[PDB]
Structure formats: C-alpha cells, structure tokens
Symmetry: C3
C-alpha cells in the first residue's frame, strides 16, 4: 500500500517536507517526508494507487516553494504502517 519517491532540486529548507505532508493529509494519505544527506527529499506515502498518483502529480507540478528538478518513483509495493504524515 505504500509508494516511495525521491525528489531532487532545491528542495531542502524551503518548506517542502511541510507542504508535502500537508498535501498528503489533504489526500488522506499517511507516511513521511524526510531530508536525505545528499540534498534530496524522500517521500513515502500510503493509501490507494489513485491517491498516490495524485500525490506524484502534485510533487511534480503543484504550487510549492521548492524548485523540483526530478521526481523519481521507487517501489510501489512497500508494506508500511504510519499513523500520520510525519516530517523527518
């Protein structure tokens, strides 16, 4: 039920983890946005494939402060349990 995404660009320190968690919550998703050591943001989100598809669209095109260069889709077959959408 979870898909992981790797987001690159000017994406740290620009409200991206916060806004991502907000959008995820508005979509009824659970999961996290995490700063990675290399400057990217890792997003894991859990729910329906359609919801995850909208989230992936938003990550690419949604109004946001960050400047997204690439949104890479990793596994879509992750089996995780999250209570909310945490910033990590």
């Amino acid at each position: 039920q979870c898909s992981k995404f790797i987001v690159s660009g000017h994406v740290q320190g620009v409200g991206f983890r916060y806004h991502t968690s907000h959008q995820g919550l508005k979509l009824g998703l659970t999961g996290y946005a995490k700063n990675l050591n290399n400057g990217d943001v890792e997003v894991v989100a859990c729910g329906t494939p359609e919801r995850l598809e909208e989230l992936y669209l938003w990550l690419q095109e949604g109004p946001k402060t960050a400047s997204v260069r690439q949104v890479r889709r990793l596994s879509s077959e992750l089996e995780h349990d999250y209570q909310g959408f945490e910033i990590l």
Copy 2:
C-alpha cells in the same frame, strides 16, 4: 455553532483534515467526525457569515472527497471548543 452532515465518498480521503484546515483558516472552532454509516459530521462555531463560507467550501471547494450532499442541521448550538478537532 452549526452542524452539517456531509454524505458521499467522504472517509479515508482527507476530508476531516482538509475541513479542519479550512475551519482554522476561517478562525472557526469545532470538529469533523467520521460517522459509522460513512457520513462525516461537521460542527463549526463562528459568525454566521464565516459558517456560510465553510458551507460553500463543504459543497464546492476543491477537495479530494466526493461530496454528495451537505445537510444543514441545527444552527443555534451553544458550544465551546478550543480548536478544530479530527474525531
């Protein structure tokens, strides 16, 4: 305070959070609650004009949920809440 019963595809789709967010942005207090039948019950406290704005939002604001119908229940409840709860 007013009470609204929202029916449709409204659970598991971020409706209570999005509602709480719209309420807080309007300075309203109250709650969005999942009902066992699949409805969501919304109580909001504020000026009549702000509660109408929440009503417009419930009906037509861009959201994930598919709202079938927004039922206007009582509008003269006298409650006190601190924030806007997701219940």
Copy 3:
C-alpha cells in the same frame, strides 16, 4: 535574516495566526504570529530575504479571512512557526 511585521485591522479571531503560520511553514520559514493586547498581530519570521518578501506579499494581498488594513515592516533559532 529576521523581520517583524505588525499587522493591523480585523486580524484577531479570524484565523490569521493559523493561516500566517501555515503560509510561513510552506515557505520554509520559522518564527511566530502573536496576538497583541491592542488588537494587532505581530509576525516574526526568519529565513532568506527572498522568502521574507514572499511572506510580506502574502500578508498584504494573499487570500485570507482577515481584513488587513496595514502591514508594518519592522526590524528583528525559532523552531517551527508558532501560534503565539
């Protein structure tokens, strides 16, 4: 940098601190939106000069419930963007 904005108008009890803090967090800012005894709201924000200009733009013209009359630019690590 940090900046302080004294916002006046119908700005209390109208979701102004919540929305302002939401807007700051979406911008990557830290600081607070504080109700003042006199009815003003005092917004302090810390981040890049560019991101602070974006907050100011929002305070003055951003869609919101509050009816802002004036936004005072004044001089000024916070964790998050606190309501009060």
